[PDB]
Amino acid sequence: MPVITLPDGSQRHYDHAVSPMDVALDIGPGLAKACIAGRVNGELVDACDLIENDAQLSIITAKDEEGLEIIRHSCAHLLGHAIKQLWPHTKMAIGPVIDNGFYYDVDLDRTLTQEDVEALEKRMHELAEKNYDVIKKKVSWHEARETFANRGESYKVSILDENIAHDDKPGLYFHEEYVDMCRGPHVPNMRFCHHFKLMKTAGAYWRGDSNNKMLQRIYGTAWA
């Protein structure tokens, strides 16, 4: 039965767990439509994450710096969604947000031409414009590993095997048939990710080790 306190001092008493989106809807339709994520007791969370106990809550929107970062991060997921359609055998490594954009390191047997990059961006726009919901599932380390093993995503499996504690609960983000793993937050729906562009590509050794495979780094940027 969490008591949720908003920035303006208002307090809402609930007798069940509620998500930032649930509370936003209670405040008004406009705020719910603008909601991208939330900050609960100082921590950024997805709009769908349940708040079990008393908490200070604030709603993150595209007007927030945090919202812009989340939009950029979801555009990295969008790149994965699109590239896995164009070249299904592609393996996804790491795709973080960077100052003014994002990038995604990938393993594909096709040395990307500028035409390939343009085709990838075109598919990204088509997918984002479908305005599909992003579905999040908090899972065990073991379920996360099985999910990526079943997809043949060896780099994601490697991150779980050597970089994520077994007691950690990875966040899985489902973008239609595509799935990625992240601390997030991510956008609740791709309608927030219509403004982006892919830029250049470069090379980067997996884990920065020249004994490992040279991956292709695809850079992009996004804005509200």
Side-chain angles (χ1 to χ4, degrees), residues 117-177:
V117 176
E118 291 164 351
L120 174 58
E121 192 184 320
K122 179 178 175 178
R123 180 56 59 83
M124 285 173 72
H125 284 112
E126 296 175 340
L127 294 174
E129 282 160 20
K130 289 175 69 179
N131 293 164
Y132 63 81
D133 290 326
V134 172
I135 300 173
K136 178 183 177 180
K137 184 183 183 181
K138 292 179 180 179
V139 303
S140 66
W141 178 94
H142 306 76
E143 184 179 324
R145 197 187 187 286
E146 184 175 306
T147 298
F148 290 109
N150 290 339
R151 288 168 68 81
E153 293 287 3
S154 61
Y155 296 88
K156 296 299 188 187
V157 170
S158 184
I159 293 170
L160 283 157
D161 280 345
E162 65 187 66
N163 310 122
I164 300 175
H166 287 30
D167 67 316
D168 263 46
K169 302 303 179 182
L172 295 186
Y173 296 80
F174 297 80
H175 295 251
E176 301 201 309
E177 81 283 358

Side-chain angles (χ1 to χ4, degrees), residues 85-110:
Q85 289 194 169
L86 297 176
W87 295 281
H89 72 276
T90 301
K91 290 180 184 180
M92 311 303 298
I94 294 171
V97 172
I98 54 174
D99 287 356
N100 304 299
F102 62 90
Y103 70 77
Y104 217 134
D105 283 349
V106 302
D107 176 343
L108 170 62
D109 300 316
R110 172 71 183 178

Side-chain angles (χ1 to χ4, degrees), residues 196-216:
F196 64 84
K197 65 179 176 176
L198 293 188
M199 310 304 298
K200 306 173 180 175
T201 66
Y205 277 120
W206 172 230
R207 297 194 186 288
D209 194 318
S210 59
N211 290 320
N212 298 334
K213 188 176 181 60
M214 171 60 74
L215 306 179
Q216 292 181 85

